[PDB]
Design a protein around this ligand. Structure first.
Ligand SMILES: O=S(=O)(F)c1ccc(Nc2nc(OCC3CCCCC3)c3[nH]cnc3n2)cc1
Length: 280
């Protein structure tokens, strides 16, 4: 009715996403068609979760067994930017700026007990002013091939209770990918994802992760790989970077660094806000 579709942006976990224009206000927006009253109330709460590093939810529209979410539109995602920067690499000051901003976003949502649970380059969105913002916070909780590459090990091992730590894991995986220009753990099945994590960080045990062996999908028959050094994992990256990444990829979700504590890490001593060159 009120929205003119301009182009399909892509296909999310819950449905198609279009760039659209509000025929009444002229506002340009992202419109997500979601393909239960519980979900309505949860989504409505998210309208109040407003932060400069969170993509704003402008409105929720249910009509005729159809649910539409109207979001703030940004002009590029991190995946396309990484791909465009592939020959050169994103400069470290911009990597650092983006990480810091995403941690501020996480810190905010986490303080309101809201998780993302499915962070990935395609839902991190950038603009021409050097900002990066998280899209689709809270949607996994609200609504209940999908990429496994950013999935925390506790999820893969069948934990039913997700903590804020699952988002730190995902963002650590993204940090590593910005630095190396390749995905850290590109699994193509749940077991391939778990074994790629184990091949790099070592098969977890009760020493490094108390309780791991009692987890639902833990098998004593898992191969026992030794941990490799982070020097080999994200090589170019300096020791402050490697320190912070190591704390973001701790196996035990209780030991994994919080967003708030990561903002105080020494890696961010010299943080700045560069503007990227974006070709739109
Ligand atoms: O780089 S591209 O030219 F490909 C490009 C990408 C995104 C956008 N803009 C964009 N996209 C969104 O969601 C995409 C969706 C998220 C994950 C699931 C599947 C894809 C948004 N959600 C709220 N605001 C949004 N703005 C503009 C260009």
């Amino acid at each position: 009715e009120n929205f003119q579709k301009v182009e399909k942006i892509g296909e999310g976990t819950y449905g198609v996403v279009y760039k659209a224009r509000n025929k009444l206000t002229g506002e340009v927006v992202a419109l997500k068609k979601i393909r239960p009253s519980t979900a309505i109330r949860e989504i409505s709460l998210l309208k109040e979760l407003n932060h400069p590093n969170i993509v704003k939810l402008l409105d929720v529209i249910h009509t005729e067994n159809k649910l539409y979410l109207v979001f703030e539109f940004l002009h590029q995602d991190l995946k396309k930017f990484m791909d465009a920067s592939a020959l050169t690499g994103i400069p470290l000051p911009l990597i650092k700026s983006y990480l810091f901003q995403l941690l501020q976003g996480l810190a905010f949502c986490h303080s309101h007990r809201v998780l993302h649970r499915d962070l990935k380059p395609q839902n991190l969105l950038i603009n021409t002013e050097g900002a990066i913002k998280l899209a689709d916070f809270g949607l996994a909780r609200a609504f209940g091939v999908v990429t496994l590459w950013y999935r925390a090990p506790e999820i893969l091992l069948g934990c039913k209770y997700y903590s804020t730590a699952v988002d730190i894991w995902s963002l650590g995986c993204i940090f590593a990918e910005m630095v190396t220009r390749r995905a850290l753990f590109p699994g193509d099945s749940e077991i391939d994802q778990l074994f790629r994590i184990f091949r790099t960080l070592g098969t977890p045990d009760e020493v490094v992760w108390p309780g791991v062996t009692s987890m639902p999908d833990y098998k004593p028959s898992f191969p026992k790989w030794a941990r490799q050094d982070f020097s080999k994992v994200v090589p170019p990256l300096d020791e402050d970077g490697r320190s912070l990444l190591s704390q973001m990829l701790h196996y035990d979700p209780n030991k994994r660094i919080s967003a708030k504590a990561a903002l105080a890490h020494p890696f961010f001593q010299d943080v700045t806000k560069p503007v990227p060159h974006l070709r739109l």
